[PDB]
Design a binder for these strands. Structure first.
Ligand SMILES: [Mg+2]
Ligand SMILES: [Mg+2]
Ligand SMILES: [Zn+2]
Ligand SMILES: [Zn+2]
Lengths: 387, 424
DNA sequence: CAAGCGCACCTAATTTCCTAAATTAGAA
DNA sequence: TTCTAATTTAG
RNA sequence: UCGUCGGUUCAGCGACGAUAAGCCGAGAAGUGCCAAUAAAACUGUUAAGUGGUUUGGUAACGCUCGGUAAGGUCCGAAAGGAGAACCACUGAACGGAAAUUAGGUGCGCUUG
């Protein structure tokens, strides 16, 4: 629903980077003053003040803590926009109400705010418009009428933001109407000395319904117990078998030093293999329902180079199929052929740590490549056509 | 005198109490310590807010004696927390509060400027014990008993503990040398703490004490230099003698990589795990890595303890009086050193306090071209040759390991001034 | 694999601290 | 009546 | 292979536990979901517009708080038994506690 994305600020559109930078640092002092004062006033509002406060010298007229704080801090913080001051004060007082019980009990001292504090912004005070020559501009309303006059920054402060990549996909929907702005912030990073514009956006999450056209493959890996990949998204999931290696070392050592006892150790092995299969099968199907795939392609089932070595391989299929087919997903058993020794990037049919295509040069994890290769619709034939 | 050190003693059995009553007390007082620490920090921040509003509205700062009724924020904090943390000893509560307010007073400028957040104190806070509230007496038979004053007058009439709480402590090994000196008078017990170790479910009596260091006769013109190398954990060289002493690593990050790999492997396994591992909060889901609590920290602590002792012993064995090392605050050539994620500050901090017990002065110098300057000719080639291993300069043909010429350089007195006057 | 957000959990670097004097209440 | 442990507060 | 005990850390050794990267119970502070309700603030002649507050329920949560194995000896046929009593090795080291800053990691949602 409410997600954020950073857009680094290139340069001020009408100001210099010195005059613009100075204004931001003054608005940062007023933001931090408002955040700390709103905590003091929320500290008094809850009746937490000590006796000496209103005894030697120092109901209130308003209804909420935000109302009492906003009017008190309004006088001094006269540079921030009146809208943005409400959002800054709301953050401080909502954090005090969140931590109220720990503050009273004594499990926490007091909420604190860092020096390089973000500058809040409301929906109506941020607007992104695209210029015809492929430029992205974000007009920001940051100053109040008294501050605009003194600072000679009349109109809004426009900044150019680098929008390239996933941002251009999100941003181009904000301008159309699919995504709508909710709030915003102007963050500062001291390790790059760059200003950012976090534009939170509100949307309707996509409803993922099972599709018989999206395919999720499974790779019985060598260093990973299982690997999952998709050809419609770079998303990947891996069923690592760190617990399986430890159990096999445990049993072997106990078998050596065990020389009924052997009968009980064999019974434990059968249970572990079955339960691990249940956990492994459920994860595979759950990571398929999440991605909206309705087809699970995999191999058909000695020890092999596969990570599981000796294992109830046939039992795992009869639990992958049963769990997948309880949710509408079908299973296609595709022979391995040369899926591992093939390039998913340029279709180069042609150690095992990283696979590097000799022509295309794509280098990625071998188990991941063997999973994308399996994931291709009807990979079995297209390899057979080349071989 | 002049040095303070601690030694833990394990508490085996509480005399005249069960382990289910003493454990209940020790955790009740572990919550009043957290309350006192956290509430006394609120009063320091509150009083600071009052002062800022007073100066703007009245010209000059207010006086605590006239508004709070006390000459310090510590006294007012004691007056307000005394009614709620009524189980702690008054002495112990006073020291606990003093730590909270002194921390605030030390970093008050940073707190106002936003550079430092207001301190917040955790659940498993150690329990404070003053010098006057700790007494160790050993019976003839050979069993040490520590008498502790942990309770207040209302508490001693609610828990039915008429006198101090006596606990049996194990005193063996180097703890026997320290304790027998405390019972004599060579060492004076300072304010101490009670700590809980979660891995073994054991309570330790961390006793801090004061001891006069031994003063060996060591010339101050003898300097040993230490270089944290790339193929060796640390290298030591001297200017006067062509003697080298090297601390080859052996096992340094083998431990760290084999602990993080399990920690990530355990957490990643939680996504597909047994039914009982989910649905019981954060602790029961991250529970498998609770066996890896401080294995890395303890391994790096003991390993650095051995290295510092070896380094200081070589300085004493060769008669060295000054130990010059690098000031790595500038963050120079990290990762490529033999130690990669090691605690280079724990090694340096340990050498300092283990050299002052030996009467050895420690001087940190600014590492600038230290590993690039040939130690015989004195010609700082901006580009030496090889990245590591053998280093051959071109004014003299001097050949040696890059870690021995980086330890024969730090060993030169006032080399920090010399190097600058070779580039300006 | 990458990037935003929310949370918590680790580890390194770094600083500060590791009270006393006087008064009172309870016990022999 | 002495005194040893606990409380209180200045610096 | 990972842990428990042998005064602390590290390693070894002796005995023991291990499917422990496992099993289980209550509950309602937070997220999520559901049903009621609509404050502050802003822009506006008003009207209206933006914004989302407050209460209850539910129990899916890296939701909260917890429980669960591990030296010898002894009683107990055996389970089991009081954190009951007693006994328990070799080498190196043995200055810590709290907080803060910074970096990283994992989990969950969205997107490429
Ligand atoms: Mg051990
Ligand atoms: Mg030992
Ligand atoms: Zn290719
Ligand atoms: Zn040279």
């Amino acid at each position: 629903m409410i997600k954020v994305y950073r857009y680094e600020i290139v340069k001020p559109l009408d100001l210099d980077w010195k005059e613009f930078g100075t204004i931001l640092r003054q608005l940062q002092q007023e933001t931090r003053f408002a955040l700390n004062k709103a905590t003091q006033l929320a500290w008094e509002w809850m009746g937490y003040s000590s006796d000496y406060k209103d005894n030697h010298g120092e109901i209130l007229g308003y209804t909420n803590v935000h109302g009492y704080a906003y009017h008190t801090i309004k006088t001094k913080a006269y540079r921030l926009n009146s809208g943005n001051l409400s959002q800054t004060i709301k953050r401080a007082t909502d954090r005090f109400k969140a931590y109220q019980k720990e503050i009273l009990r004594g499990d926490m001292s007091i909420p604190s705010y860092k020096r390089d504090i973000p500058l809040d912004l409301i929906k109506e005070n941020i607007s992104v418009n695209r210029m015809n020559h492929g430029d992205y501009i974000a007009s920001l309303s940051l100053l109040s009428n008294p501050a605009k006059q003194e600072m000679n920054v009349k109109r809004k402060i426009s900044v150019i933001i680098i929008v390239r990549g996933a941002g251009k996909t999100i941003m181009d929907r904000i301008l159309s109407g699919e995504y709508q702005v909710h709030a915003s912030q102007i963050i500062h990073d001291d390790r790059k000395n760059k200003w950012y514009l976090n534009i939170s956006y509100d949307f309707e999450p996509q409803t993922r319904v099972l599709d018989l056209n999206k395919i999720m493959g499974i790779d019985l890996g060598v260093a990973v117990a299982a690997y999952m990949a998709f050809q419609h998204t770079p998303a990947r999931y891996k069923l690592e078998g760190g617990e399986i290696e430890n159990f096999r070392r445990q049993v072997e050592s106990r078998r050596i030093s065990m020389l009924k006892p052997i009968e009980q150790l064999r019974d434990k092995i059968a249970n572990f293999r079955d339960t691990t299969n249940h956990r492994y099968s459920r994860y595979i199907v759950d990571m398929a329902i999440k991605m909206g795939c309705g087809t699970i392609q995999m191999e058909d089932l000695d020890i092999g180079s596969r990570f599981l070595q000796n294992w109830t391989y046939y039992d795992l299929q009869q639990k992958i199929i049963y769990k997948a087919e309880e949710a509408g997903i079908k299973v296609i058993k595709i022979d391995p052929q040369y899926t591992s020794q093939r390039c998913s990037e340029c279709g180069n049919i042609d150690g095992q740590a990283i696979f590097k295509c000799r022509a295309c040069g794509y280098e990625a994890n071998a188990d991941y490549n063997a999973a994308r290769n399996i994931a291709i619709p009807n990979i079995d034939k297209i390899i057979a056509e080349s071989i």
